[PDB]
Symmetry: D2
Subunit: 387 residues, 4 copies
């Protein structure tokens, strides 16, 4: 039951199952994983592929000779398992040089280094077949008001992304970029803190078609936002290039729980939306097996990510296919929501006395929306508590 | 000291000082105010003008004859005081017909009514000289997942705003629209919940130049966001058409405290940003004098709004003009943040060995940012605790 | 399937299904319900009983003759249905006189009135058979720091509850009191804001045995707290006298969604705890059918409250009875958690070299907790996705 | 201006100025500090003393010979500066053995080790003159529901604190214990998450007089709570044994900003309360200089902690001494709040017709509370914007 296969497109960051368990108050509880072992174990669980930061795959400061050997071993593990690499990203946050940011560091020479580090890994990402290059600006922001002029910082951020777009264009690469928002942590406030802020920023880039979002369940929930709603707006804009799936219990530090944990009903509505919209990208998990766990718990937590997605996929499909639900959707006028408000045009609307002068506002107000019965059918379907 | 005058452009909604004190758990504590008295009393306090919902000025369901008399009295009070009306808006949230929204109600006939109600008040707003027409979609959203298909809802929302833009264009009106975001309340989740989501939505409208944002201090803080940061992004996009000033204590119900209350330091950084950027629009207060207060407390609370803005304006100006602060800003490389990262171009950056191959990452990492000393100078200036 | 009966002890406030839908931004969407109709309709759904504020049952300002007639009709509906009244409470928050509180109002004459109003309704509650008298101090608190000296306010609060305990003792009543915490709304901050603060306050009362807590799901979640954890501490203290069941989506205004909505997994763990601990009190719903709904939606939402409790009861029982779960609980050392740490005593612990000098800290640290596998078995049981 | 001296009782944890800047996403940005240098530099800034975890002072795993030498050097630095050690604590959270807790770890042998580790450091704390021994149970809690039976965990927690009380009693030590609450991080939910939960727990200990709270500004604010209100309840209970001062911007990860940063007005009301109540304990800073800073920024941030306390002390004293404020406090009936509600007794209250039958509820409701004018006088005093 609910067994994932590579055709389900489930992917995992090397940094996820490979997290050694260091947190702000605690030392590692697990030994480091060889990327080759993660590829092997994830393939055995039914994963489709992996993703990486440059520094997850090649230790920072590696010589060219060491760099070549790390990539060669990794490619052999991919070849031996059929695993893919659909996405890569740059670590612009761990090294102390990035303490005030990469692309928006106050120090200009750090901003130039951040771009050179990113460009080097874009080449490698293309080599390994990645279709999406993610940017998580975790250090872009501030703890205090005078430290960061945000208009200047957004100028620098646009400059950086424009240069990266110029680079991929000049090389003929087919890879696209995805900005991963986060509202805070590790900076007190992070720039482009939500899906909305990232979508708006992209529209000011020189080549907007090259950039989308990589929203993460837990990050929008750290702002108390409705993650399915934000995904809907990203899809509406044509910008859901990639997605990070995990769990989060409300407004607190970034928990990165396995997918399905945290807000279970939001996970249900998320899967319902991705499947209804026909999202065709990776189902990527950006999660951390809790540091309480040994390696057996690591793989159990990764397996649970995929299992929960498949259970929710089943229940959401059953919800939408249920004739009683389709009747309830009509009772709640979801069919009317999908119809144009005024396809007859502005002048016809202005001349339509049924839209104002003769609109029975009291009769309309008395019509119940029937949303609670619809939602209890959704609850029954989620819980397998129908007939 | 700190006495406002009309040239300070302070404005107030009729619904602010006129709030009778009804909350979810309590009846009114104050009698209704005649709009004429609010205009008179606000002018005596040094206000520049007022704003209104249609239904604040003309009671819902008024005949044309009653409507004309309400406007005539209001115009006489404006004429007798020199007060202006820079902004107006539509009440699309109080009447029960709007229980599932106005522009995105599931019922199509309600959406058409919402547009007709708005268009009627746009005409009146232009008559009274308003330059900005605000939309707060407080009922657009959902308490449950099946009740609202957000992609369909965003289609309906774009349709509505496009029709309104067609209308003002067809009439030759110079008024512009401003969307006021709010993340939640009274709906469980509201569509376009933050400044970012509204900015992104506007870029998909047919005539984007006609639409900006009207951000509110408390609303972005209900999502835990940095309000000065969001204003900076709105200014960066050229979309700060109007602003709502008030106070809020973190992530909870919408408090609408007087400006300066709530997050005092965020109020300081907000005023610093508006004045440095040269924001030229109204300094509008969307606030509610707490229902503990009688009418004397109402006017004291309104006076405090303007006083706190003027105190913060003084302290922020003193901060920026202090040579010791300018030195600290240089020590923290705010000057470097304002310089292009790579005006020499992509190829020059790729060929610059000082940006990668020869970049001393350890020496850069060792450079302290000196942000804490800068922030304590800011604190000293805010508190008047310098020399 | 999952059909409630009166033996399930489900109860509802008159103010819940009777909520007309007025919120801070909107007028009523439903007509007022006669308490007699609510009793009848709730009995038809399988409820056990109802609860009331004084002013829900007898309109404020009623004459003695009107008061007697309202109670007489209500008692006839209870008699005709078999419905009970296990709990009553006082409205100390709607009338404007309570704008700064009841028991902790700054005005002394208001505090005396609050006590007289409460005592009158305690008599009626005893008459109708209630075993618990709830106090929700929704107006006790402040929007500003100078307005309320909290130490003085806590003195006044202790005085009020002590007088009420003296009263019930003097009358020989068997009723007990339960304090319902809420962190905020309608006051900016409410006194005794969480289960913990209420439990601590009770220990300073003259007769602590007469007072417990009435925690509400949504209220602890408005502080971001774990509601099952707080219930566990209340049970540990012997103070879970009553409970309010509903749903809430994180840190925002008090939503009062139907039970099972909001945080579904917290609802699962809550039911698991109440049933395992043998909680014998009412399963009371303090919820508001969303104002989108007509009366049919009101009763569907109330029915969903009870259905969701019964589904979760089934799944939690299946979880605890599953031999594979019992094995996982042993693998995670939940059996060891239940054993005394040092029943051998302090001196034996000090002399036990295996507790320090010879404790292999590295071998202990390497033991995985196996919590993720346990939690995925819990998820599978909740979703009915086991065998 | 605002220069601290040792008589101001300002203290700092070794782990505060000594924080190397490692966060969940980043490596250290500063070298480790020798405790001797921190003592010297803090004394030069005007500090009164320092506090320590066992493992801050003596590296984990030290031999007795190394342990003696670390303490000897530390004592010489204290002797050479006049610095004191008023508080000590145990690190029960960094080492991987504590991944599921210390006192409430599921593994019994870990719980016994946690107690032995604590007892060893209590002896050292007494040796160094500490009057308070703090417990921060940062690992006590859970990420999932099945992992931790909270009633069993609270049994184990009571057992641990009771044994510690037995130990100090048996040794004749005068030191007392203080529990430091935190709602979450690094565990998904932490046991005893707020001041209220800790106060309530203490009342169930065998020797409650030996235990109080050590509340931290940022921790209560991570639950969205009013920190001055919680301190007031702790003082009301006689349990404010110690306090952690810092700054926090709302509901997010634990920021540990310098005191005065974050919620500035809450810092003002906190200082007003501590000084009015005559709190006589250490003014302890549990803060982290942001990792953007070099060592010069470390000492600037520490200096700002003390400066902000002294500025706020001045402004709060000026507020309370201002005859215009004293008049406003009377206008708002703060004098009536301090008077007993019914010193005439229950029967007199029941017989007082002015408390009910003849109480003019409308005249009382019409009395404005005048809270907004009072709060603007408080704002003017905080900002130095009076005469
Ligand atoms: Mg990385
Ligand atoms: Mg283009
Ligand atoms: Mg991610
Ligand atoms: Mg309005
Ligand atoms: Mg255009
Ligand atoms: Mg507003
Ligand atoms: Mg009531
Ligand atoms: Mg007793
Ligand atoms: Mg309740
Ligand atoms: Mg420590
Ligand atoms: Mg004792
Ligand atoms: Mg602390």
């Amino acid at each position: 039951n609910y067994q994932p296969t590579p055709e389900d497109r489930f992917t995992f960051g090397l940094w996820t199952v490979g997290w050694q368990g260091r947190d702000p108050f605690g030392d590692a509880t697990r030994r480091a994983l060889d990327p080759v072992e993660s590829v092997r174990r994830l393939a055995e669980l039914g994963a489709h592929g992996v993703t990486f930061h440059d520094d997850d795959l090649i230790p920072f400061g590696s010589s060219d000779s060491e760099r070549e050997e790390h990539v060669k071993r990794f490619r052999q593990a991919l070849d031996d398992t059929g695993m893919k690499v659909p996405m890569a990203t740059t670590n612009l946050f761990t090294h102390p040089v990035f303490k005030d940011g990469g692309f928006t560091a106050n120090d200009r020479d750090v901003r130039r280094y951040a771009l050179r580090k990113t460009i080097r890994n874009i080449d490698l990402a293309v080599e390994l077949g990645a279709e999406t290059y993610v940017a998580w600006g975790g250090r872009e922001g501030a703890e205090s008001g005078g430290a960061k002029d945000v208009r200047d910082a957004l100028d620098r951020m646009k400059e950086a992304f424009d240069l990266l777009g110029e680079y991929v264009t000049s090389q003929g690469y087919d890879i696209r970029f995805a900005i991963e928002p986060k509202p805070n942590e590790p900076r007190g406030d992070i720039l482009l803190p939500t899906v909305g802020h990232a979508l708006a920023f992209i529209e000011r880039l020189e080549r907007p078609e090259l950039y989308g979002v990589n929203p993460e369940v837990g990050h929008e929930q750290m702002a108390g936002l409705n993650f399915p709603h934000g995904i809907a707006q990203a899809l509406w804009a044509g910008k859901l290039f990639h997605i990070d799936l995990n769990g989060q219990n409300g407004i607190k530090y970034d928990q990165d729980l396995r997918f399905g944990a945290g807000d279970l009903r939001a996970a249900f509505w998320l899967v319902d939306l991705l499947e209804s919209a026909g999202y065709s990208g990776p189902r990527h998990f950006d999660f951390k097996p809790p540091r309480t766990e040994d390696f057996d718990g690591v793989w159990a937590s990764a397996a649970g990510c995929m299992r929960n997605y498949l259970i929710l996929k089943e229940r959401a499909a059953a919800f939408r296919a249920d004739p009683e639900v389709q009747e309830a959707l009509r009772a709640s006028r979801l069919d009317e929501l999908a119809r144009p408000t005024a396809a007859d045009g502005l002048q016809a609307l202005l001349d339509d006395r049924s839209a104002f002068e003769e609109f029975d506002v009291d009769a309309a107000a008395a019509r119940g929306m029937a949303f609670e019965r619809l939602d209890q059918l959704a609850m029954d379907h989620l819980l397998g508590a129908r007939g």
